[PDB]
Design an enzyme around this catalytic site. Structure first.
Site, short mmCIF file in Angstrom:
data_model
loop_
_atom_site.label_atom_id
_atom_site.label_comp_id
_atom_site.label_asym_id
_atom_site.label_seq_id
_atom_site.Cartn_x
_atom_site.Cartn_y
_atom_site.Cartn_z
N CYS A 177 -3.33 6.47 -10.74
CA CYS A 177 -3.45 5.87 -9.42
C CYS A 177 -4.87 5.47 -9.13
CB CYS A 177 -3.01 6.91 -8.37
SG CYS A 177 -2.66 6.29 -6.81
N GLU A 186 4.37 2.07 -5.58
CA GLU A 186 3.73 1.47 -4.41
C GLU A 186 4.45 1.83 -3.11
OE1 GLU A 186 0.80 0.69 -4.94
OE2 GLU A 186 1.15 0.40 -7.09
#
Ligand SMILES: CC(C)(C)[C@H](NC(=O)Nc1cc(F)cc(F)c1)C(=O)N(CC(=O)NO)CC1CCCC1
Ligand SMILES: [Zn+2]
Length: 185
Positions: free
Chosen positions: A111, A155
């Site tokens: 991430c 997401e």
């Protein structure tokens, strides 16, 4: 121009909030933000620009990651060799249906907001259908499978205050679930 300094780090409270629904039409500022989110991804994938501004090579970004608690995402996945590529800016995206069968990246996930790697499989749905609006408020329905399904799920998780490592099994982090599809990076 967004860069790594705009990306907030794990521990920032905005990453654990539930992002707010956008009212349509978007404001000019909201459109500009979403366009810049995509442009960060475009820049991060350009070898020279990424080198110059110290960018990590990104395939997706969610508004909460730049401290904006709004349900907007950008996904930019280059051609995997099969001619399939994904360039989407989505407003209020929602998974409306999905497969029971799971899928996972063999080396786990990472991430933009997380500095250090966290080992472990992240099981997601292999197939999803998403409904959303585009930047102009028009309707988009996506049918996704495998790698792009994983990216979009990652997401959307950000919009609900969910981080990839929340899905890792503490005892057996590297054990695939029965019948889960290994997805080639
Ligand atoms: C964390 C990071 C490493 C920056 C990751 N990028 C990535 O995996 N890029 C990549 C890999 C390739 F094999 C070829 C290529 F062209 C680019 C990423 O952008 N994200 C997006 C993100 O932080 N979203 O919030 C994490 C990904 C891990 C699984 C899905 C998204
Ligand atoms: Zn992420």
């Amino acid at each position: 121009m967004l860069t790594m300094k705009d990306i907030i780090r794990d521990g920032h409270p905005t990453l654990r909030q539930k992002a707010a629904e956008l009212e349509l039409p978007l404001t000019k500022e909201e459109k500009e933000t979403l366009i810049a989110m995509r442009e960060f991804l475009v820049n991060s994938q350009d070898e020279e620009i990424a080198k110059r501004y110290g960018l990590r090579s990104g395939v997706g970004l969610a508004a909460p990651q730049i401290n904006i608690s709004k349900r907007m995402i950008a996904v930019l996945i280059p051609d995997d060799g099969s001619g399939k590529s994904y360039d989407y800016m989505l407003v209020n995206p929602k998974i409306v249906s999905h497969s029971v069968q799971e899928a996972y990246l063999p080396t786990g996930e990472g991430c933009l907001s997380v500095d250090d790697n966290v080992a472990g499989l992240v099981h997601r749905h292999n197939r999803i259908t998403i409904k959303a609006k585009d930047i102009e408020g028009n309707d988009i329905q996506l049918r996704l499978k495998g790698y792009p399904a994983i990216v979009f799920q990652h997401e959307i998780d950000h919009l609900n205050g969910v981080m990839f490592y929340d899905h890792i099994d503490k005892d057996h982090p590297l054990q695939p679930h029965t019948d889960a599809v290994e997805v080639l990076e």
